[model samples]
Target: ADLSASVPTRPAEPERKTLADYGGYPSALDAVKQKNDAAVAAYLENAGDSAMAENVRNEWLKSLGARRQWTLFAQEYAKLEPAGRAQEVECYADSSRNDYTRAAELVKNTGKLPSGCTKLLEQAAASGLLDGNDAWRRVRGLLAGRQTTDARNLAAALGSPFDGGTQGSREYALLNVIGKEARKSPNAAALLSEMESGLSLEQRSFAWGVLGHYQSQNLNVPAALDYYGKVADRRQLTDDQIEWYARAALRARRWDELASVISHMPEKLQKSPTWLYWLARSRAATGNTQEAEKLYKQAAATGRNFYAVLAGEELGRKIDTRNNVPDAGKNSVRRMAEDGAVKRALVLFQNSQSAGDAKMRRQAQAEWRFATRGFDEDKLLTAAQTAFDHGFYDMAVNSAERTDRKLNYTLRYISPFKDTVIRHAQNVNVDPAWVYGLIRQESRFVIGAQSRVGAQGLMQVMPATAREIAGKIGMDAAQLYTADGNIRMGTWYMADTKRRLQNNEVLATAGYNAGPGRARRWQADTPLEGAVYAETIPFSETRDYVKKVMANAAYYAALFGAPHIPLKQRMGIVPAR
Candidate 1:
């Protein structure tokens, strides 16, 4: 059972020197701490070509920019490698030179500008280099990204009135209030209508689209559709706006509107598997069977993702959940084991595990990625197998899942702690396959995994959720880090959610990721097809999570030899609230 014991041992290697070991690094850091520019420069002179030199120089550049020492910043910035320069430092350089043209370009390219870039954009706008159209474009981009505060500030800087401030145009202030109200209130459309005469046609259209997007998110299909219809030009709607318009139509089962909205989406969104499947569904509902079948076949052939499975089922094809690729040979595995970067990554991983160092773990991941860069399918399989043998389950899955031609289901859908997972699942009367599917997505079987948001262990149960579950199950929350405790609680929670959500696995799976309240609120007035409900989930993360978990369950059911249920049957119909 312990495959690692059968592997050949490698010869011992001497310790490698790190950047910190270099003589000049400590002195350079000390000079940087003291903000002694001349001293830092003196240290850099003899730092040679050590990696530490680049690090120290970058730190110095940051210091110069922060202190507004433009002359020093320009000198250091020029010497730094182009690839190594930071965006903020570049913005500072542009600001120092009064280069509003470059500042405007940077504003256009960056999604969320940092402080330095924000200052540059402000300066550019104040000097008239960034015109009304450019400023509005940036404002619209920020709004689309849900950076409402930033959008409002940028708008204000460009002479639009603040919501309650008295400095700018009253009409623009009303537009600002309308945008803000759209996110939380159903009355945003009414407010937009009242302010329509004072606003430009473009502003009127934007306000309407914003109202429509929020209405769709709130699951008010009729109002969303009406607001979207009010937009003067569909082309003025952002990609996000168009998507919500399509979703609203789909939720209402209006096939003609759904088809029209989807067809008019940006070219890239039109080609996604989700849209393709829905487009096919809309065509079929509208009596275009031949075209719908063609679309389904095209989507089915995309891959083994959720939409692909649904598309295949539409064509009456049985799901193929088998691992078709042959296992990596011992020689291939040994070759990867002997790779220098791979060896470094492995060592880093071992150190990270022992010390529980998050930073070191991130470094190990980067090293592993570097080691596997440009690898062909066979080499990737070898790397995956090598990682698996070393108990680097996450890395193994990451590598295995990247191979397009040579699919390895075993590596991709690893079932570590099988007995523990199965026992807990059965104890709670939940599906072991579904639990394993959730675990695979949650932690990739990493026992000590932790999310940025404080979700812990294999099941990734949040501490607060763990506390509640622990109280009900009579276990300490401290035990959540253990595989047994985490899965026990996770399985119980899944079962509890299922019972509360009308015993629907689809609803339970959704509730597990997003809260139960949101899941219940997402239901339509009439019962909806499981796939349709999943496709229309408001939160993008939960929408994708539900699909993947269901798809994964389908595979695991096949793997574990459970009574076969088609994926559609597993999803079932999501009942009306």
Candidate 2:
């Protein structure tokens, strides 16, 4: 939060190099990028061993003086004189930007960092994840010591450079980091020019997407917005891709894009304050007052009382803005149980089963039981089983209702899909509960929902993706107006993706939000660590979608008398883990 302002700017007059400049581009740039890493480790094992290369041993000793061993990259500088080590320590002590973070790490660990480390970190922040945070500062310190830092070198650092290979080379490939780092340092324009040299539209668009988001998180709104808007019109985005772009546009203050996002939802769901909040804000941003007020009203009316204290806010009533609107006629059978006509609880519970972290699931279950007293156990049990068998893997969550304990749910969160959430999930070889979780994260299961960029339906499908999916599923795109087809088709489409990716839930989930093709390419270029793969899916929607889908699948599966299924199982549990 508010992470942008904290970064220290990069140095001026830094020279740049292209991927080719980095020695004909290593076929295994990723692999060879490891440099003296293993050697350092070896030296660590055989402290005074003469067998190790002198450079490696020196690098290792240099790293030791600094005391920061967590992150180091190739091309970092090492200090010899006491003054040099002191400078490294000082940099390490106040590391704030990514470029500096590298230097800081080296300085702190070995008391010496290569001159090129800062450049590598700069390249990384340009790609995002180097958002001038604590870690970023370490990188900057490392970058500051470099002489001829190339894009490939910086990219190598972003990957785990401890061990190098073809993966490292691919990682080191020159991509767009130029513009990104330039923004961080007013003087980095030269360095950035080098980073952006020789890249295709696809590569630039992809790199900028990361830059845009990084700026958004760092509170560089104008910069983030511009970066995202630059790629807004690119073709071939999935519901998830559009979300990222749309989010960027919002920051860019692109009111029209924001309006389009809100209008794209299923229907009156757009009226719900869940999305209306942003719509109203955007409308107002562009001076569309009347429309904004109307949107505000619609949002307030559909508002979950707990979300923004909408009714109270309008009435100037002091109320906790945590209400989640659930319909159960006031003063009716349940109204008698209502205190002050306020439902007071959702019995919201986060569900998971994979047993990945039993403590978390149990905490969720405990909370669920406390939320519901008379909730039909059989109904809950059946719903769980139904979802599990049919592959609506997401439905197996700990039911959100009054359980053995009570805790309030976060109303600000997007809602979850429940209507056929389990039913449809079962059909797609996915967990219904996981689908619900995805829905919860996406549109909060607001079927009639719309995003700032026109995403629609229960699954928050973008119009483009929906159209294609509709056609493939034998449904007319025009008919998405109807809920049944909207949801059914979306699920089937997801199934199609799952099938296409050989049922790797991670890949399938990536496809669900990004696209089948993009997901494959991501996996192809980088053999990512499972969690890292999910985290770095290149689109926020898909990244979050994959995590939520798998977690939901696991929790929902647990609901069906089975423990949580690993994400691998959600697609089509292979013979092996």
Candidate 3:
């Protein structure tokens, strides 16, 4: 049962003078969610510059629009940070009048008119505010959004010759040729199977690119690789499509082809430590040891991120353990925190606690963003120090990352619950660095963190799994939430998984996310390198989680007193299951 479903709606409001009538209400956001107009109004009057006040006002603007109270909406609309809904409110307000220009501006600002906006579109066209080019672009937008029927009608409205677009004309019968086929069979393989050779190169490439993306997503490895080859221009693919192309090539064991694909990617992607590491592996596999060695060194020296550590391991280097963060001066930090926005954000942070808190957290985060908007490097460092001092470790780490210059690794990775984590690690005979790293990724040191899937506490152990781990270790249920208790249970679970996978931490980490059975099933038909096993894990989330956890452990090792071990040696070879 959904726990949220059990929560009562906002307590009934009795109208009275002053904002004190809202004393019976739940959280401010809950009132906003329930659209308690009186309560929202009261909160707005009572709370000034409070995140909750802004949160309530923003929601009330939508409520005003829903009730078609345009006069009030106009007064309150300025309170909203400009977004999609604000534009809609503006357009709707203008639609009440004959102000075609204002309405057109609003609609244009929205990027495209969504469904149920036919009147808006038609009115603009009738007023001569919308032209042929505008209609064509909107139709293209609608078609892209899969509003095929809307696009078809709009094309006819534009006097477009839909019968294959006037014989030998420049424009093709787009909706008929592509959208119609797509709607009929959503599968990329199915769509391309009956496609003819009569289409132009660009058109065919688009189709193949679409198929390549779909096939890769659906885990049709061979088919995706084949379709990727069919595309004439790889640049036509989206970032997601290109990433999938790389994944598909790696899984298909197309070593040479994978390197070629990575080389052709955008410079940003080619520079990614992920691609760099993979390319290095490809080079080494193909006997280009000279170039592979250089690539490994480049990747290892890049940063302490996931692929970087893996690159270091490949080069037989241990973790780069030097503390590189410059000490943030206390005076500078104190002055920075005195900024109006920063002060306001800090106030918001102080108000939000753990229970029913996602909304409050979002509000605080929004305020933080508003505060730090346009911050230079020094301002970012100052903000980070301030957050760190306030025990907002997540914000501190995240803010420190915004600097474009030299990185501050000490600030990036802080040691929280050090004693508890270390004790638990010793009890389970696992590396403390690994435990810290996993916990960082799992909950970022938020003791009350709970995932949507019901994984609870810092280590995010699920209830069922928590119960089982408790039983195995003779733990009381309360220990699952306590600092020492949670870490104890989490480490035991990690160790149990590690033993199950024959000391393969890579598989053990994957098992922690995807489950032991799934991890076992993923073992190769033949012995494989750790990277190969990770690359083809099928589930993107688990694959990423494992890599980051491994990388994080390497960093944590260097952060403390441990000797750096080559990440590859730590990863070792994953034997055939």
Candidate 4:
């Protein structure tokens, strides 16, 4: 029943525990949910004609544009809070825009904070975990500004075991802020090098990378390479950041294990002129000209940015073989959109002409118009319907992806390979939009993302599952840790679950989240509605996970221009007669 709230096919899991399990109000949560919107309206109405409720309400409605109910509900808590603190404090914590800004101000106001923090400041600092607050990011920006003695002192502070300071989070926070500063310092080079043995894995790795850079700057070439060379051996760095270390290795001229680190980058990123140029330099320096030239030509493409030009200079040759070939099959669209080029498109979509930048406006307008002209909604919808109807997911997904709108930044932000997500979705017999939705929820399309539970890559596949699934299919499990490999493994694993679970997407999905055995056990002899079952899911995370995933899937489908398929249809919810 808890699962039913999220998906149509989820079987109910009614507990057979004592009567005590059946609490008062029969459906307190249900009542709350039923009147949530009306309650919001009532609360806003209390604000009267001149209050900020309407503005808050409008913003709340806008956040729901992504169809993220969890976010909307959490956000609604704050707007609903003025009624009373005890009843609404949690709500305020979740939603109020002012709340986040306030939290940031709390942190900023404590600029020269000590080791231990007051509850107010501690809560403020941790708010970044809540909204990934951009305001507190200024803290990072400011710390990045520290020089020399600051680095050394901060390093000393951080490297200390809180032995002299107040201890606990105070030390942790102080260490973090100071440690970050230390890594940024040229003067703290020796401190970073020395602290490596005693620091935590994350701190040690960061300090080591910085120390590597610092050593290279000071012309302690061999010491610099040593710091860079230890990353892969320790296996402490994340896949996404492995490139930074690899780049460090290249800069240090440590060709040994360079190829191994380079292998971890997404294939699309690997093919970049930057990578190619670096590879060429590494190869040429080691008396491998033939390989170096091959890479040079690959790096010399038409739009090969400044870095690519630098690589050409490295090889002492002027090669103009920069690629014009589209790599849509690779997942680099997200990367492209992050660049200056996409900003120009957004400018064009806005008011470039009115802004008095005619040339730029024209260029922006041309790219925007040209890129979007073929994506007529009606035609694309028809194509999508036909593809879904015929079970030809490739065509359906291809059709869905064609309508790349500035409005749908969901797709823009989620995966490294926006184009291939469609292909993978198709292969899995899932809606490409739904796949995009899951990606949005799972990792926001950060392909190399890692979860606290060790889920890796685009879909955040748990490491054990990645290995298991890869082994079952005779794939090299070790490769599953690579960005592309993890995506492939997770996609295939999702497909396999779909096939095994009798086309009950919800159950299969639940299985993906919490294993098939547990999903089945939770449903045993239960007589509850799907929605009730979802709300009562045995595992708190999976219960909520099911909700967000379904909601996210609906959002993607709607955003990708498919509205006819309601949440009811997607969740396969056949109403109780």
Q: How many clashes in each candidate?
A: 0, 112, 0, 29
Cα lDDT over the full model 3: 0.67
Best by TM-score: 1
Residue-level lDDT of model 3, residues 353-386, one tens digit each, is 5334554555566667656656666667668778
Q: Which ten residues in a row have the lowest lDDT in candidate 4?
A: 1-10
In terms of lDDT, the best-performing candidate is 1
Query: Per-candidate RMSD vs. true structure?
Result: 5.9, 27.3, 9.2, 26.3
Candidate 3 residue pairs that clash: none
Worst 10 residues of 3 by lDDT: 1-10
Q: Model 4 — TM-score against the truth?
A: 0.31
Q: Candidate 3 deviates by what RMSD?
A: 9.2
Mark the regions of model 1 whose C-alpha exceeds 4 Å error after superposition. 1-135, 143-174
Q: What TM-score would every model get versus the actual structure?
A: 0.80, 0.34, 0.70, 0.31
> Measured by C-alpha RMSD in angstroms, how accurate is candidate 1?
5.9
lDDT of 2 at 359: 33
**Candidate 2 lDDT, 430-547, residue by residue in tens:** 6565555456556444345566787786677788887887767677886665567667876777778878886666677777777788787655232434544554455656755776
Off by over 4 Å in 2: 1-178, 181-433, 524-527, 563-577
Error of 1 at 384 (Å): 1.1
